[PDB]
Amino acid sequence: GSHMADCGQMQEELDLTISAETRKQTACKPEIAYAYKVSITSITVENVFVKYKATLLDIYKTGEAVAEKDSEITFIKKVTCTNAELVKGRQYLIMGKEALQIKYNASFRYIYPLDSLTWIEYWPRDTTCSSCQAFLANLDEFAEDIFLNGC
């Protein structure tokens, strides 16, 4: 019963190659409905299906799935994911299509499906701890870029 899947494919933590435009030419992309940075604050784990309670930090691209400055998002997926692992306390960037909607009364809502399309990139919470500080130089440019400039 050994299964393998890229699930919510992730990216490198620190690698000099991704410029500020790399997170834009794909941000304004139709396949992408939203482009904001959030942070993990709570994680849920069940028998097989698990969820992730995280707060939105800032939105660079409005989300079709009810996206607002500092909201309440929850990512759900199967434990069969052997390529994605979120940490409680760290920050992660997300740029992708909206989430499925089922909200009818309370037993339903949005709960992101968490797939490989969901462009996720670990954002080093610290800048002076790894003695590196290099990939965080191009990210700062995109911050005021999409906000001001924008596609």
Between CA 66 and CA 79 the distance in angstroms is 26
Query: What residues contact 136, with CB distance under 8 A and at least 6 apart?
Result: 124, 127
Between CA 136 and CA 37 the distance in angstroms is 14
List, as one string, the DSSP characters of 12-64: -SS-TT--TTTTTTTTSSTT--EEEEEEEEEEEE-SSEEEEEEEEEEEEE--T
CATH class given for the domain over 9-151 = mainly beta
Largest Cα–Cα distance in the chain?
50
Query: What residues contact 62, with CB distance under 8 A and at least 6 apart?
Result: 34
What strands lie across the sheet with 119-123, from one edge to the other?
A: 72-78, 49-61, 34-45, 91-96, 119-123
Query: 90 and 39 in contact (C-beta within 8 Å)?
Result: yes
In the chain, domain spans? 9-151
Query: 33 and 119 in contact (C-beta within 8 Å)?
Result: no
